[PDB]
């Protein structure tokens, strides 16, 4: 497989400060293409990537309506959830959801997703079969019983196997110049003396897309997983990502270290070393 479409929805209650804010952002891999925010002066589904803009007026209308209705559904869900947990009307709470599909290079469904988390803890998820649910506790079991009764999984499955895979295929075609393009990382190794005894070797990967990457340091061909400092892959702001991995090495031993870089935009993985 090679592509995924996903929607990240966050509904957060704020007693005393209005109705729960609902925001939904849509992504194709690591490219956000839409956002809907109930807090926008005029909430509507809005392009966040050039290739979705060409979509017609009815596209925006239909999705805007789907999002306004989801805002309401998630508000009622937060009410229900407060009750399931015997929580007061005074506290603030968050209901999050992620839904979407993964398709192979040929565009065939690899797998579908539809899961929720309440206050940061997993709550309920549609299983990979796209037919049953896994509830995390007794409150989620209530949601499960209701979903089973209304045959909700069938609806999500039909969306995940049809509509989601079809839109993803259309998006991929309309934005093939970027969505289908992997940008390899630009790599280099820097060296920062810590003392007369040790120095840090930092291996950089910049300008890469998608975010998926693996940077590792080896001393004498042995992975230094426990001794490597790895920062979380971060966005540069231009669609690309950055990441570094560092290792503290004894002065004079820098050549025994090699940095290994794996990225899909690289034909063969790279091996680099500090080059004075």
């Amino acid at each position: 497989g090679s592509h995924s479409m996903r929607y990240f929805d966050t509904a957060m209650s704020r007693p005393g400060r209005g109705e729960p804010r609902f925001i939904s952002v849509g992504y194709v891999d690591d490219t956000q293409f839409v956002r809907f925010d109930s807090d926008a002066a005029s909430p509507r589904e809005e392009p966040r990537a050039p290739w979705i803009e060409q979509e017609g007026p009815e596209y925006w209308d239909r999705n805007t309506q789907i999002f306004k209705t989801n805002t309401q559904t998630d508000r009622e869900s937060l009410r229900n959830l407060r009750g399931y947990y015997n929580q007061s009307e005074a506290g603030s709470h968050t209901l999050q959801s992620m839904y979407g599909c993964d398709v192979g290079p040929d565009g065939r469904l690899l797998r579908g997703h539809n899961q929720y988390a309440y206050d940061g803890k997993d709550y309920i998820a549609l299983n990979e079969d796209l037919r049953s649910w896994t509830a995390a506790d007794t409150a989620a079991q209530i949601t499960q019983r209701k979903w089973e009764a209304a045959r909700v999984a069938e609806q999500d499955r039909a969306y995940l196997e049809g509509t989601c895979v079809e839109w993803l295929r259309r998006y991929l075609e309309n934005g093939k110049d970027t969505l289908e393009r992997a940008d390899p990382p630009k790599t280099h190794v820097t060296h920062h003396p810590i003392s007369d005894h040790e120095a840090t070797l930092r291996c950089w990967a910049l300008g890469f897309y998608p975010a998926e990457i693996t940077l590792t340091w080896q001393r004498d061909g042995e992975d230094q997983t426990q001794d490597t400092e790895l920062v979380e892959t971060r966005p540069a702001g231009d669609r690309t990502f950055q990441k570094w991995a560092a290792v503290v090495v004894p002065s004079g031993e820098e050549q025994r270290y090699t940095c290994h870089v794996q990225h899909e935009g690289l034909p063969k993985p790279l091996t680099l070393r500090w080059e004075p």
Binding site: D9, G26, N63, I66, N70, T73, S77, N80, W147
Partner: peptide, 8 residues
Amino acid sequence: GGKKKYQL
């Protein structure tokens, strides 16, 4: 394209 969500 978005999905119709159901009440939990």
